[PDB]
Design an enzyme around this catalytic site. Sequence first.
Site, PDB file in Angstrom:
ATOM      1  CB  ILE A  12      -1.075   0.023   1.193  1.00 36.87           C
ATOM      2  CG1 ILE A  12      -0.396  -0.106   2.538  1.00 36.87           C
ATOM      3  CG2 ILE A  12      -1.831  -1.248   1.034  1.00 36.87           C
ATOM      4  CD1 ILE A  12      -1.533   0.424   3.661  1.00 36.87           C
ATOM      5  N   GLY A  15       7.687   4.290  -0.987  1.00 33.37           N
ATOM      6  CA  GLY A  15       8.414   5.707  -1.057  1.00 33.37           C
ATOM      7  C   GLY A  15       9.494   5.307  -1.330  1.00 33.37           C
ATOM      8  CG  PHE A  17      15.957   5.003   0.900  1.00 39.48           C
ATOM      9  CD1 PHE A  17      16.789   4.242   0.336  1.00 39.48           C
ATOM     10  CD2 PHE A  17      16.097   6.356   0.757  1.00 39.48           C
ATOM     11  CE1 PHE A  17      17.873   4.739  -0.565  1.00 39.48           C
ATOM     12  CE2 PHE A  17      16.837   7.122  -0.306  1.00 39.48           C
ATOM     13  CZ  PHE A  17      17.919   6.085  -0.785  1.00 39.48           C
ATOM     14  CE  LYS A  35       8.497   4.703   6.482  1.00 37.98           C
ATOM     15  NZ  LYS A  35       8.183   6.225   6.890  1.00 37.98           N
ATOM     16  CG  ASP A 128       6.041  16.421   5.020  1.00 39.45           C
ATOM     17  OD1 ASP A 128       5.972  17.156   4.030  1.00 39.45           O
ATOM     18  OD2 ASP A 128       6.013  15.257   4.902  1.00 39.45           O
TER      19      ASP A 128
END
EC number: 2.7.11.1
Length: 299
Positions: A12, A15, A17, A35, A128
């Site tokens: 899902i 990114g 790395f 992750k 961010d």
Amino acid sequence: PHVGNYRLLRTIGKGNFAKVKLARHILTGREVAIKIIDKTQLNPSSLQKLFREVRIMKGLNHPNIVKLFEVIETEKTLYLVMEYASAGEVFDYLVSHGRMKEKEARAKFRQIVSAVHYCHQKNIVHRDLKAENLLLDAEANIKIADFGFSNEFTPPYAAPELGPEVDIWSLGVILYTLVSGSLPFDGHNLKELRERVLRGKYRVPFYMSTDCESILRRFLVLNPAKRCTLEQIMKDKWINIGYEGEELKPYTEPEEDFGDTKRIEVMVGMGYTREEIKESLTSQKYNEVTATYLLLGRK
């Protein structure tokens, strides 16, 4: 197919790395996101910041911030096991389902402000905050993600400058998008998005309240020096309409509840021991045992 006590379902995101996979905890059955960072392809000096951030992430304990569950390390790969925000991003909800009514916006913007304050109060700045980190759980509740990572993870919502003021702006933009349903500073090219963000000039739709406009001004001040503090903005009139005897307060964490006998019985029935459980929850080493305890109380 398998990692830890987790059956892997479907990817899902991918990114730089890092790649996130949806998964299913075998023991408890619950659903999680994982992750996956390859340590292989990392500056060793960056790992000093990766783990540093993983430390902070373990300290995050808020109802509207993605909680860490389990950490699984191999010399090759780090597996971080987190909450899954089943409903997904907020702006895919705002394009699909349209703008939100000030009641719904208020509800969601409280959760946001609570979470960001709590994190500021632990000297963490996202810097961010954007479309992708504002998420929603099954029960339509905010889940802020990657708050405190500086990773590549997996321009409109950012300030005219580009600590806490970088997010204050960001919250202002988000508030606008919630009530209006559209971005304040959008466009085609990125030389365009500067002109609009730098002027800060937005359009005020007819349906936006005067109170809402007023609080929007507190957030989107062009000088960060005069921008309002979350401490204060929690007292804003708009933010507390419908919450009369529930004026928004800074989030304070709950007490430890490491002694739920009913969960422990289940975990004992899973093969764990009372000692393993006690040692693991106290030391907070985010192992298979701590994870299984947390998931067993999730719903």
